[PDB]
Structure 1
């Protein structure tokens, strides 16, 4: 049920770790956007994936591109996790309604109540140009993300 390439990316307005509202449409005309859905703060695979994003942030957050992480945790969880891990990119809360944005992108695990490892690249017109979804026990290849953003510069 993952939204595929060519679809309009569902707009959302979610709180980041500072309780600031972030809207996907705010980036239109300005930047390509990488959306990194993931299961849960303070779990091993998620830590590894976001640590790698952190460690390569200039490839993902720059004049051409922005990166947003999205999970079902509320802002205080994300704030502690980001501060302790050195994450400076936005971590957005798909918290209440629980998983609504993850559901809209077709990447919600209804059984477990978490997003799967869904990744999208949204172009400057708001269209999905890259889409994948791995299971919670898998790890994503971030080369695909940089390959996808490079095609839209």
Structure 2
């Protein structure tokens, strides 16, 4: 429904890669970067966070394509930072360099249609282009993976089509 249309606006408190706190606006990216917004339910769960770290291993691939990677859950910035300071051995995410958003009011998850049970989000990926238009949505109800390779391809394909259209 917001697909092919403007990304709903969000402002949120965040933890940057150097571990300081701050704020991120959707609008600080219009005309400058693509945004890959991804959602996951909760920090410190018993599902191990292979997805998040896989996405961080590929951070440079994302910068090559001019995309800002943003993770987001309803946990507070402090839980996010505490998750970072936790050894991977213990189920932590270690010291990732991409920024994590705190959806502390849950309104961002409401806005993006990914809130479940007025509680936590479902797993989701949203790809927002340089005009703030949503080009791609993926919503998973289950704790399964998503290849970072799959995501890279999608980005390349949309950037390719966004500039040459669609023949073969």
Matching of residue 89 in structure 1 with residue 98 in structure 2 = yes
Distance in 1 (CA, whole Å) between partners of 2:135 and 2:121 is 20
Stretches of structure 2 lacking an aligned partner (at least 5 in a row): 87-93, 161-168
Distance in 2 (CA, whole Å) between partners of 1:62 and 1:24 is 20
TM-score by length of 1: 0.87
Alpha carbons of structure 1 residues 59 and 83: separation in structure 2 relative to 1, 3 Å:
farther
Matches within 5 A, 1:7-46: 7-17=5-15, 18-45=20-47
Q: Which residue of 2 aligns with 1:121?
A: 127
Count how many residue pairs are aligned between Structure 1 and Structure 2.
Answer: 148
Distance in 2 (CA, whole Å) between partners of 1:46 and 1:61 is 25
The two structures, once aligned, show a CA RMSD in angstroms of 1.8
TM-score by length of 2: 0.80
Match for residue 141 of structure 1 among 114, 129, 147: 147
**Contact 2:58–2:148 (CA under 8 A) maintained in structure 1:** no
How far did 1:56 drift? Answer: 1.2
Larger Rg: 2
How far did 1:137 drift? Answer: 2.4
Higher alpha-carbon deviation: 55-64 or 115-124 = 55-64
Q: Runs of 4 or more off by more than 3 Å in structure 1?
A: none
Distance in 2 (CA, whole Å) between partners of 1:132 and 1:57 is 20
How far did 1:129 drift? Answer: 0.5
Q: Which residue of 2 aligns with 1:53?
A: 55
Stretches of structure 1 lacking an aligned partner (at least 5 in a row): none
**Contact 1:54–1:86 (CA under 8 A) maintained in structure 2:** no
Alpha carbons of structure 1 residues 124 and 77: separation in structure 2 relative to 1, 3 Å:
same
**Contact 1:121–1:148 (CA under 8 A) maintained in structure 2:** no
How far did 1:124 drift? Answer: 0.2
Structure with the greater relative contact order (CA < 8 A, sep ≥ 6): 1 or 2?
Answer: 1
